Design an enzyme around this catalytic site. Structure first.
Site, PDB file in Angstrom:
ATOM      1  N   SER A 197       0.874  -1.188   0.000  1.00 48.04           N
ATOM      2  CA  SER A 197       0.000   0.000   0.000  1.00 48.04           C
ATOM      3  C   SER A 197       0.905   1.229   0.000  1.00 48.04           C
ATOM      4  O   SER A 197       1.704   1.381  -0.911  1.00 48.04           O
ATOM      5  CB  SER A 197      -0.953  -0.014   1.217  1.00 48.04           C
ATOM      6  OG  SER A 197      -1.929   1.026   1.165  1.00 48.04           O
ATOM      7  N   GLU A 324      -8.718  -5.157  -4.508  1.00 48.95           N
ATOM      8  CA  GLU A 324      -8.180  -4.030  -3.770  1.00 48.95           C
ATOM      9  C   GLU A 324      -9.252  -3.010  -3.353  1.00 48.95           C
ATOM     10  O   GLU A 324      -9.181  -2.432  -2.271  1.00 48.95           O
ATOM     11  CB  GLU A 324      -7.127  -3.330  -4.633  1.00 48.95           C
ATOM     12  CG  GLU A 324      -6.059  -4.262  -5.199  1.00 48.95           C
ATOM     13  CD  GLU A 324      -4.871  -4.436  -4.257  1.00 48.95           C
ATOM     14  OE1 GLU A 324      -5.075  -4.348  -3.023  1.00 48.95           O
ATOM     15  OE2 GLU A 324      -3.737  -4.669  -4.746  1.00 48.95           O
ATOM     16  N   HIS A 437      -7.609  -6.033   0.314  1.00 51.75           N
ATOM     17  CA  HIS A 437      -6.388  -5.242   0.286  1.00 51.75           C
ATOM     18  C   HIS A 437      -5.543  -5.571   1.521  1.00 51.75           C
ATOM     19  O   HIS A 437      -6.069  -5.677   2.623  1.00 51.75           O
ATOM     20  CB  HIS A 437      -6.782  -3.761   0.286  1.00 51.75           C
ATOM     21  CG  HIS A 437      -5.628  -2.813   0.177  1.00 51.75           C
ATOM     22  ND1 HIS A 437      -4.801  -2.767  -0.925  1.00 51.75           N
ATOM     23  CD2 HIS A 437      -5.192  -1.842   1.017  1.00 51.75           C
ATOM     24  CE1 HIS A 437      -3.903  -1.808  -0.761  1.00 51.75           C
ATOM     25  NE2 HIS A 437      -4.120  -1.232   0.410  1.00 51.75           N
TER      26      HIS A 437
END
Lengths: 532, 532
Positions: A197, A324, A437
């Protein structure tokens, strides 16, 4: 003593820890910078002054001052990401997990946590390097950096809050791993930094920034690239939000010094209470204070750097998760609930596209909607839900990473691309969220290996394959074993564009990860918004 | 005598003709207007003056002066469309096929041929009404109208070439069928007009124009609707091309009278030799002289008429062919050959999109390209060929007709939609062309019934089903038999949007004919070009 190490900053006393019924050494909470408190807030980090005596590094450090998620009190699903230690502006420390017996010159891996540049801790359970260090025999380092306004406030032109001080923190930590990891058994000329991320975007940012390029060998980026629409802003926008933040706390706004001083006198939780009010649009997957294209950390614009080949040419291994988006629709898009199938109607769908592409005129919102709607089944709540989930992910993580990998591969010396599409069996989030995610992290750190966590036999297998891929790549620059008999993870080339899926099934190679949409998000839409 | 008919214009002597080993009457070449020659060129048609004695109507009339295709000398595939009679400015005549014995008050069907408004004859073999009249027991009328500059030159404001005189010709013919078909056994209060290509667009145009609405009962439109991008122009553009035409023949351009006079003194083949030079763009599927939104034949703009419900509310049955495009790519897009598989490369593909959407800026050309390209197989010559084929058809025939049918169905009293997707077995064109534009006509006129033409048993069956659909609809306003046991052709409704395929297979109903693309061509693209 194996637990005693004499570094260039002073002596450090670690502790012995149990792992998979064996033991390894752990030096937790080693400082790498002077406490960024008081008049040092928003200011660049300064090297930690040497110390006499032995530093006690047997317990985790504090967590950077940050925003805490309270959307689901008690829910492990979200709290496993919140800080598990006292928050304090005095956060700059790092953690080292060293094998036993201590190696002479083994491979090093430096982990940079993610969190939207507004949250994150190295101390979280999912980021326990002992399983990986032990299983793969590598020195695992996990650093920390300032987040939120504390690490990204930017008043370009002023040396009191230049901006990007959060990226510098990371660079500092890396400088230390480079000047001292050798005393821990690590080889400094073979360090791999890897993130997820915002961490994946930070890695990519060190690959671009001249000042960091020389401090690592290879890089691994997970679900994140530097050129993501949320990873950075212009000095103009950074300045705009710096001021607005000041306006929410009633600060004198006659000058930068005027503003900065008012902000330095506020308690940490006061800047955080109003942090989210500076965003320019009603949006999803966007954060207040993030890196800024200043002209120093980043010579020019990211796009021209990528087109000019101006960046560290080495090997990289990167990939994304199947779903995601979901995590951000749950928290911000109307219609989604942690406890329902969250089927979305036409009205909410369109409210979703508005929230996902905040910087788009009415023509763009139409392009996105047309590209993501099956008009033969326009009112299918499960299709509108999965379409929204796709828009959010493609635009924010996948199409941006595919643009990076393609630009990179043209001047790099090796690219390995993956696609994680396995939903862990013990996930506590609803099914409609899918391969969420960040949930590929547990496999990287090998949590499946510990029985009591309840993973399946095939999941633990997947975890070992992955730890061996990351570890082998970190050492050699290739995820595959020299003369192994297992399936080979093909190299990604401008021509073939091959990649592999990463799940409990017989490895399958593919091509052109989401090209149909990636072309819409990288070529067409950008251009459309420019002409209109 | 059965072959002698006394009309309001004078007596007419027809002839007896053989059909499927039986006989019917045929009155060929009946005049309905005064020869539009001399000073009458470009001028509105005038009613044919009555005549004494008997008019000999046993042989076909002449063909309107037109452009003749010579792209494939000898090739039946293209010559079966060229004029089969002496061309002459004196073209306004009509043909009547009456059953035997003569009916008292049977259903009437008036056919308006197509041809891009620049070509066409009623005398072509494929347009022989005897098979249909005989098999379904209807009075089949086929009229003719002026084409090319001769029937569509437009200098708005001048009564010497008002424009749309070609549509008036058709209206004239219809006025006659209305004042006289009763003397042929036909019922004037039950006349169905039906057309194909420009003919399908003409039908739709009579449904819109106030001056024609009262002259027919139902309508059948094939592969053509009034709102097609090629079916009409603005007075401004009509004026532009009128002048440019004059400029190619070196005419005095000081005034309309000045120009018109020069044009009236030119031999027919001289206006035709330069006709194609007036087009504003390098284009495919566009014609020089076509109907113009003047303000008379058409009160306002077509789009506002359709939105206001300003049009004859009745029943209509319409549909399209699977592969309408192919025929125009063959003649004008680089890369296509009558004798090769015509696989198209990326370069030619894009040269194709430029030729197909002539009025599109560089952003639009990109939208079209993105919407029609499988980036997972971008260099697949068969996919680029079939994509081009689709673009041309969707933009020119299908997406425009679906916009009409949807607007219409909202105020109409019944809609029946079909999709012809059967390639005749005896077609002489290459396979890559598929179910070619206009080749559904042979089934409507029942040519499969005549053995010697070489159709299969199932094809002749298909032809009878279709003749019974068209004929039943013409009589009752519903293609289906009252209490039949056959499969029902569902009605098209704003809600369900049902339609059927028309091939030698068990009828299948479907929904939303090509909606994905129809939305791109009717809503998104139009809007995009407006904003940019």
């Amino acid at each position: 003593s194996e637990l005693l190490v004499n570094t260039k900053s002073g002596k450090v006393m670690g502790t012995r820890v149990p792992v998979l019924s064996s033991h390894i050494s752990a030096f937790l909470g080693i400082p790498f910078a002077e406490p960024p408190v008081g008049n040092m807030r928003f200011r660049r980090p300064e090297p930690k002054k040497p110390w006499s005596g032995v530093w006690n590094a047997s317990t985790y450090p504090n967590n950077c001052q940050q925003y805490v998620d309270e959307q689901f009190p008690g829910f492990s699903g979200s709290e496993m990401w919140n800080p598990n230690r006292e928050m304090s502006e005095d956060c700059l420390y790092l953690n080292i997990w060293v094998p036993s017996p201590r190696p002479k010159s083994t491979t090093v891996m430096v982990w940079i946590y993610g969190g939207g540049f507004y949250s994150g801790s190295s101390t979280l359970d999912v980021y326990n390097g002992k399983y990986l260090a032990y299983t793969e025999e590598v020195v695992l380092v996990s650093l920390s950096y300032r987040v939120g306004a504390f690490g990204f406030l930017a008043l370009h032109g002023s040396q009191e809050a230049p901006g990007n001080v959060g990226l510098l923190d990371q660079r500092m930590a890396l400088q230390w791993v480079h000047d001292n990891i050798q005393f821990f058994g690590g080889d400094p000329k073979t360090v791999t930094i890897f993130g997820e991320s915002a961490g994946g975007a930070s890695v990519g940012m060190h690959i671009l920034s001249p000042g960091s390029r020389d401090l690592f060998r290879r890089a691994i980026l997970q679900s994140g690239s530097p050129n993501c629409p949320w990873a950075s802003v212009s000095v103009a926008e950074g300045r705009r939000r710096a001021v607005e933040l000041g306006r929410n706390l009633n600060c004198n706004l006659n000058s930068d010094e005027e503003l900065i001083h008012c902000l330095r006198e506020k308690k940490p939780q006061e800047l955080i209470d109003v942090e989210w009010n500076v965003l320019p649009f009603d949006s999803i997957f966007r954060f207040s204070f993030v890196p800024v294209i200043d002209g120093e950390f980043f010579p020019t614009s990211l796009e021209s750097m990528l087109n000019s080949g101006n960046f560290k040419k080495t090997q990289i291994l990167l990939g994304v998760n199947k779903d995601e988006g979901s995590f951000f629709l749950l928290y911000g898009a109307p219609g989604f609930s942690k406890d329902s199938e969250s089927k979305i109607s036409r009205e909410d769908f369109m409210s979703g596209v508005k929230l996902s592409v905040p910087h788009a005129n009415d023509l763009g919102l139409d392009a996105v909607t047309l590209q993501y709607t099956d008009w033969m089944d326009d009112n299918n709540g499960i299709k509108n839900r999965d379409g929204l989930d796709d828009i959010v992910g493609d635009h924010n993580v996948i199409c941006p990473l595919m643009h990076f990998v393609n630009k990179y591969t043209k001047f790099g010396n090796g690219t390995y691309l993956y696609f994680f599409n396995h939903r862990a069996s013990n996930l506590v989030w609803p099914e409609w969220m899918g391969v969420i995610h960040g949930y590929e992290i547990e496999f990287v750190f090998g949590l499946p290996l510990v029985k009591e966590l309840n993973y399946t036999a095939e999941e633990e297998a997947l975890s070992r394959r992955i730890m061996h891929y990351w570890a082998t790549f970190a050492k050699t620059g290739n995820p595959n074993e020299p003369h192994s008999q297992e399936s080979k993870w093909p190299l990604f080339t401008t021509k073939e564009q091959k990649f592999i899926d990463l799940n409990t099934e017989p490895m399958k190679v593919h091509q052109r990860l989401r090209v149909q949409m990636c072309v819409f998000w990288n070529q067409f839409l950008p251009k459309l918004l420019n002409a209109t």
